[PDB]
């Protein structure tokens, strides 16, 4: 899942990055710590999505 955001603009990409860092990351880690989390792949996939979005931002903005 990369092409659906490869063509997005900087502002919307940053908004998506902020949304991903706020939701599904802080709540996910809190749930995992509290033990209410049942599936652990959520953290891995959200972290990989964050890394992918950061890479796209680095590639687009600047260079």
């Amino acid at each position: 899942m990369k092409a659906k955001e490869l063509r997005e603009k900087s502002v919307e990409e940053l908004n998506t990055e902020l949304l991903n860092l706020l939701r599904e990351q802080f709540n996910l880690r809190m749930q995992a710590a509290s033990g209410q989390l049942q599936q652990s792949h959520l953290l891995k996939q959200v972290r990989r999505d964050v890394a992918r979005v950061k890479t796209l931002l680095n590639e687009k903005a600047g260079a």
């Binding site: 990351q25 880690r29 509290s34």
Partner: peptide, 9 residues
């Protein structure tokens, strides 16, 4: 967002 990791019980 990143500064906070988990709660303590």
């Amino acid at each position: 967002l990143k500064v906070l990791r988990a709660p303590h019980v």
